[PDB]
Amino acid sequence: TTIVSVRRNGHVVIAGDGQATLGNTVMKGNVKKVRRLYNDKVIAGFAGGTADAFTLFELFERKLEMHQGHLVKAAVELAKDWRTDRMLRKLEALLAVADETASLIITGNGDVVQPENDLIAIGSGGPYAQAAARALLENTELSAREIAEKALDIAGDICIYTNHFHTIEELSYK
Amino acid sequence: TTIVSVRRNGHVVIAGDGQATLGNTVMKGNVKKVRRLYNDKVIAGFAGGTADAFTLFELFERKLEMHQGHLVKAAVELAKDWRTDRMLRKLEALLAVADETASLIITGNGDVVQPENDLIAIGSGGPYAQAAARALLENTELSAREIAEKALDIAGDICIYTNHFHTIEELSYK
Amino acid sequence: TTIVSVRRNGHVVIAGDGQATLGNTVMKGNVKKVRRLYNDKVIAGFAGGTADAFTLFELFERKLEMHQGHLVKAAVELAKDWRTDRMLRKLEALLAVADETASLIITGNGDVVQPENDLIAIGSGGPYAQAAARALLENTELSAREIAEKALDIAGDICIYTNHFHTIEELSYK
Amino acid sequence: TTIVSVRRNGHVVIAGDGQATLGNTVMKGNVKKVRRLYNDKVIAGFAGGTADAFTLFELFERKLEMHQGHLVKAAVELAKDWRTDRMLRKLEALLAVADETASLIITGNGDVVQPENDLIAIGSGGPYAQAAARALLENTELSAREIAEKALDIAGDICIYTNHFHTIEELSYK
Amino acid sequence: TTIVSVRRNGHVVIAGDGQATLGNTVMKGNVKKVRRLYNDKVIAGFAGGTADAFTLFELFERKLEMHQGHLVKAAVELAKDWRTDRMLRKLEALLAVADETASLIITGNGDVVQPENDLIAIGSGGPYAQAAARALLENTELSAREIAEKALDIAGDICIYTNHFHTIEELSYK
Amino acid sequence: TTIVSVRRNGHVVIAGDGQATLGNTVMKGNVKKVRRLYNDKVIAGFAGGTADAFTLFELFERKLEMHQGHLVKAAVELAKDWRTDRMLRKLEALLAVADETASLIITGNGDVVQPENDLIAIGSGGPYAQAAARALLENTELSAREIAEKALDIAGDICIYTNHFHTIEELSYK
Amino acid sequence: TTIVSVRRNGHVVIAGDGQATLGNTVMKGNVKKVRRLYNDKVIAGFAGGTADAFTLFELFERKLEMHQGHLVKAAVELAKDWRTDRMLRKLEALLAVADETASLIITGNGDVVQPENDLIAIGSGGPYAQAAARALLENTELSAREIAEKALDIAGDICIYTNHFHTIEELSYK
Amino acid sequence: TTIVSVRRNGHVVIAGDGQATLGNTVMKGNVKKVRRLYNDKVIAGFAGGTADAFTLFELFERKLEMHQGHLVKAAVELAKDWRTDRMLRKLEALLAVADETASLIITGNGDVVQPENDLIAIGSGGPYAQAAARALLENTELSAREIAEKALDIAGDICIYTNHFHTIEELSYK
Amino acid sequence: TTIVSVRRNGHVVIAGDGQATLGNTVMKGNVKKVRRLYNDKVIAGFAGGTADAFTLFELFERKLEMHQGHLVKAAVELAKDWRTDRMLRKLEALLAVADETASLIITGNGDVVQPENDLIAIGSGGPYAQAAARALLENTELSAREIAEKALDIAGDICIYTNHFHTIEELSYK
Amino acid sequence: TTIVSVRRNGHVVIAGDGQATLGNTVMKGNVKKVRRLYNDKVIAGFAGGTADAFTLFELFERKLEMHQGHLVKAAVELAKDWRTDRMLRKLEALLAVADETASLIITGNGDVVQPENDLIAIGSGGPYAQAAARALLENTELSAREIAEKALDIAGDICIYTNHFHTIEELSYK
Amino acid sequence: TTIVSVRRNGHVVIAGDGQATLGNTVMKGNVKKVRRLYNDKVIAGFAGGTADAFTLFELFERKLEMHQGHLVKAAVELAKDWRTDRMLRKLEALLAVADETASLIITGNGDVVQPENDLIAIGSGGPYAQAAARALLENTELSAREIAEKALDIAGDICIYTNHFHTIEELSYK
């Protein structure tokens, strides 16, 4: 699994592969690991069980409604209940989420993190995608969509747990 | 253990072996690993302890009653409760279920998965059956029952933990 | 890694993938795991270190010269020296080899095996390919090349350690 | 793997399965693990690599030539060289051999063993076959062939590494 | 430990050894692992702690009184509370029980199983006894008592955890 | 640690060493591993943590009050609560207890056991003492106190974890 | 495995069981673990592989020839070469040997040991037998043969890896 | 450790870090892992012990002399002696070498490898550098030196065993 | 990870790196491992999960409110609750905290420790920094900020898990 | 850690080192592991976390007030609640305490122990100090203070976890 | 173990502790881990077995004779033979050596390393000493002897396996 997020020129994207591995076998190659949230104003991705993310995504929209869609404050309340609740503590996933404000990562340890350039790269192939996205962002004028697309393909060539099926959700704010 | 599910021409089937292995010995060769659920509208299989599935299948039917028989939504609620409950988390099994709508897999990690062609193959012999079923599904006009039957016999010849005792539950919707 | 051998209608083939994995990382995707031997009379494949097979294949040609190209007798002498020599015992690979006479497997344990229909499938993806090839060989009139090619692609879709880069060496005898 | 030897009413037999396992996968199901030796005077079986037994069986015939077909003395000389030679010490197999004189087992540790009633049962399913053969030999008047056949089928139903393909070589001396 | 149950000619029996092992030592050789229940209408055995079975046996008689002595339905209710109750879940034993209706096995996983010919064989030496009992039942006219007696003796010769002290409870219904 | 119990001629004794080992060092050599219970009507010993036994012994006396001092029935209720309670399951000890009625062992697995001649021998040196006691019990007229004393000294000379410090509690009923 | 040596009243004996265990299975119950050496002047026993002892016993006779039958000096030369030679170092066995002079143990670590009263007890059941033999030797006038026989039977009742098949070789010197 | 090789526009380079780790400690940060060979016609790098490469590089120059500077044939002769010689087999390193002809990798297993675009990336940070170099080579017109420099810096930011000290040897052939 | 605390001339500081390692890859290089607490009267650092500390730091401020900001007494109450609570016991972190009174360490084992000169150095690079700080503290007149800064850079050059990104919070009391 | 207690000539002392180890590093060398309790009438020491002992010491003074300062009875009530309370059960420490009456040890298993001569020696270096203190107490007329001082220094020279910083609290009663 | 090498102002030194640990026990505190070589022209130290270094240091002098005292070239030949020879490969030690030319480290992996400022720090306490020596070398004018002495004392205070016994060998060249 690999998920990338890039922000450039008033645009931010999130891309993820579709591979689902069971041991040394491929279970499903067209998994949709990216989706939109909060009435199309928020994009998000997840590395882990499908249902574990759907639960965290729904509760994340709840925290956004309490906080008027504030991404950072809602992310802290989600990470707060994730570590706290005995039910949510059992969930194991790596969430990635972004809006026009900023991009950040959420973990099951309760840790909320914003990467240096809002450059997110998670999953088993995350480090491989961060290496490629870091290269293009500093050496090219390519849009955030082209960077996340090419970086995810390179991660699929390297990571055995990542394939080349792609799902992207762009958000333009300019 | 091997369990196969094929969907074709308005028909969907679930087939599984009957071998139950204890270490290097066969404990029972006529295990019924396939059964019907929700008043004969749903077929299902399981790879693991027999009572572990009977517990999960009964609760899955209760999730269908709360969701009016919706397969996907009830499968998530089952996967949510599976990972969450301290008693259900001890269960170790691989569930397979299908209706006229779609086919999907349920796991103890809370992951709900629907394979590409609704082609499910689980158990120690799953990947064996999956490659035989994929070959016939694309190169023959055989019905879903004929594919799951021949694929399960091939997995029994290959997997040492799978035998040729078979149990099938077809569902026709056309 | 996956390697297939099929024999039908006076033709026999050997096909294998090109993936080379290190941990969870793909090292090389264009590895040639199939080659010809004994002045083009024999085709062979290997699952393991590249040089480990080049050493075994070289000595196997020498065993063919002492036995005048007899495949079975030279394979036993190879398997004899393989387990015997303290240098060769350190080698770890799974050999596959065939001629117009028959097809057989050679292992580092000194075990020489000729499968049921001369249908060889080895590597981490071997059993995946064997179930696909078994399905087409009984239900289709496809030539040995079409079976090994389609079976190897199915194994690459399932096995995470197998890719879709192909290398084939057919031998026609009729 | 399972191999049985029974001696009754001037008759002695050796029977074995044909399953050849590779990990959790069946490699070949029609392996001939039983053969004749010393110009049809001796019957023998083996549990292990095919070539490892062909080497030991060849040398065993030469030990019979030096000892004029004496089974016991040739078996000790084979077991003596087996542990001694650095080449033969790498071989790993369980040999079973019998003639009109007596039945005995040979191991890579150099140990030569004659069971109580000349009842040999080796391989992964050996103990399961000895349990059934011991029951029939004391409670039935069945011939040695009928006992070894039914005991081997029972071992195949229990042992996952043993199948129901059979190979037998009877020796009648009366 | 080994326990056998055979049903033939209107008769059904349950036999078990008396060995109680503590590590590599014998703790007690005259353990009574078989007893009668439900006012002498039911026979039962157990492989595990003595007190764990006495608890499950008493509760099994309770389930029989609620269900008017129905063996199958009471076995399900026992397996239901065994897996469910936090107290009973700690118990570790393998129960075997039979009446004039049928014979079945009960486990701590909650799984209820009826063997093919009502032929039960549990314990560390269970597979050894099933191999012998399967041979005699198909090849002899011996009564169920003689089969369980001879099969248990063979299991004691093979299994190091099983001795030759025997306890039997026959039930005749004809 | 070694603890012995012998019953002869209307007398029953329990003897144990006083060695307490921490790794490869002796922590204390005068431990009192034997004591009296239930108003001097019952003698008992323990191999393990001293407070683990003091907890189990106190509850065992409460079980005797509910059962009017019945040894066997109270021993089962203790073994039932031992395995069942989450706090008692953490305890690790080997209990030995006897009265004028019989002698028996209690374990943390919930197993209650009465040896053949009411001859108990537990601890790391138990099997040592058991063979010395079995020899004297059958070939001498020595009283139970003389047997348990001499057998414990023999176990101290053999077991590195057992010393010659002794504590005995005899019960005479005649 | 259990082997005992007792010396009394101008007599010395060596007794051992015949059980040969593989995992949890008895392979052979009539193994001869005791034999005579050096033209009937010396008795010996072994715990381990049968051929491992036959090799050590043969060389031990050669050490006796170089030292004119001196037991102690030849045992040191045997233990010297045992740990020394790269071939002999792979052997794993526990030797026991005695003559009219003294009794002593030989090990694969090169350790030569003569017990207190020339009372040897080795094997998995050795310490069991040693405690029984120590009890009878001090409390009875029984001959060395009666002590080793009764002590070996007690060890077989306790040790799961020791049976009651016996082999004895007495040496009378007076 | 990380080493990169890029070939573009008649130019080829080899770059590597200078970090030398000892457990979790940095031993030296200015290691020269890149050097020139064969009178400035060849550039090479190594991942491993410093002296292990100096030995292999010296012998590689001698293989170039016998083959008149032929890179491929000398690399096979080096890989042939590397696995063969008992002295060289103990060496553990990953060699990287290139000239105007082509670029290739040499391993201690004897395997000689040429990557797809002559793009070599080895060491603990090798995969991270190949991800970035692959991105720039396809999406930029940057020279081979600019790609290897930026890819090595990205690998140093990711890999904990790689630092930002650089050593480069370019070869221009045009 | 490395965290340093120095106290000198009425000043106390806490400095830490920003490296966050996942396996052999750097996850984030700008982590803020130092922060202020209790209305800017207290400085603190942490080595471990970011949210683990945010949980412990918030409760530590509550302990300061109950104890009127007393550092030592509140640190014990935090360490008491840390080891005691089933939820807090799962936390894994190394806390460092200081005020104008003293400096001390808090651990998950419940151990509260105040180093000799109030010189704290924790994390994988702690012992590295501690030896650099000890050298400057005794041989220079440098202020506590200059010591913690230079010592942290030295630990970053040595520790592979520590970088040169720095965060400091000084407290002046004079 | 090492702690010693000696009683002689109307005087009793408790001495302990100051080393606090974190893995293979020294965390703090001046730890006060000895203190006075119950209004200067009781001396005590502890091996473990500092806060864990402070909690047990305070509760120990509570038990002394309930029991009028009786050392033995209060020690039992402390060991009773230590094992019982879910909060106190998490504490891990080794307590040593003494008054003019007697000296004793308290553990987290709930075990209360009085050494033979009231000679306490706990911690990782405890056995080393007990060896030295045992020598001086029987062979010299040295006071209890001189014995505990010299024994603790010897334990520091031997134990790597013990240093030579000392803290002593003498109690004179005469 | 800790060893330091510092070079400054025409002077170079090597200092090491004298502690020798076995498990958790100090074996010897006055070990000489530093010595002179090549007729007093060279100083050296070692971390590991004493005889392992005496063998390596003797051969190193022979490598200096063949190379006329060249430190670097003789160190490579030593590291070459170290990894090469089957006898030398068993040696485990960390060598440190220096002359007026340069300072360098030698390892059993064949790795020769010269640190940045010729500042060597090896052993379990090496990294501790390196951080102290790095602090004084940049912030003080202290001579190389004063730095290595103060740095070694700091490592002994931190490392539990390092003591304050010192051995130094200075070399002045100016």
From Swiss-Prot, chains A, B, C, D, E, F, G, H, I, J, K:
| PROSITE patterns linked | PROTEASOME_BETA_2
The protein's Enzyme Commission number? 3.4.25.2
Q: Which residues does the record give as Na(+) binding sites?
A: 156, 159, 162
Thermal effects on activity, per the entry? Optimum temperature is 55 degrees Celsius.
| GO BP annotation list | cellular response to heat; protein denaturation; proteolysis; proteolysis involved in protein catabolic process; response to heat
Catalysed reaction equations from the record: ATP-dependent cleavage of peptide bonds with broad specificity
Any one annotated GO CC term: cytoplasm
Tell me the Pfam families matching this sequence: Proteasome (PF00227)
Give details on activation and inhibition.
Allosterically activated by HslU binding.
Question: What Gene3D superfamilies does the entry give?
Answer: Glutamine Phosphoribosylpyrophosphate, subunit 1, domain 1
Q: What is the effect of changing residue 1 to S?
A: 80% reduced protease activity in the absence of HslU. Almost no effect in the presence of HslU
The keyword Protease is assigned to this record: yes
Q: Where in the cell is it found?
A: Cytoplasm
Coiled-coil portions: none
The source's domain of life comes to Bacteria
Any GO MF annotation of the entry: threonine-type endopeptidase activity
Active site annotated at which positions? 1
Q: What is the effect of changing residue 2 to S/V?
A: 80% reduced protease activity
Q: Which CDD domains match?
A: protease_HslV (cd01913)
Q: Which UniProt keyword terms apply here?
A: Allosteric enzyme, Cytoplasm, Hydrolase, Metal-binding, Protease, Sodium, Stress response, Threonine protease
Q: How does it assemble?
A: A double ring-shaped homohexamer of HslV is capped on each side by a ring-shaped HslU homohexamer. The assembly of the HslU/HslV complex is dependent on binding of ATP.
Provide the family line: Belongs to the peptidase T1B family. HslV subfamily.
Summarize the protein's role.
Protease subunit of a proteasome-like degradation complex believed to be a general protein degrading machinery. The complex has been shown to be involved in the specific degradation of heat shock induced transcription factors such as RpoH and SulA. In addition, small hydrophobic peptides are also hydrolyzed by HslV. HslV has weak protease activity even in the absence of HslU, but this activity is induced more than 100-fold in the presence of HslU. HslU recognizes protein substrates and unfolds these before guiding them to HslV for hydrolysis. HslV is not believed to degrade folded proteins.
Which NCBIfam families does the protein's record reference? ATP_dep_HslV, PRK05456.1
Protein name per UniProt: ATP-dependent protease subunit HslV
Q: Which organism is it from?
A: Escherichia coli (strain K12)
Q: Which gene encodes it?
A: hslV
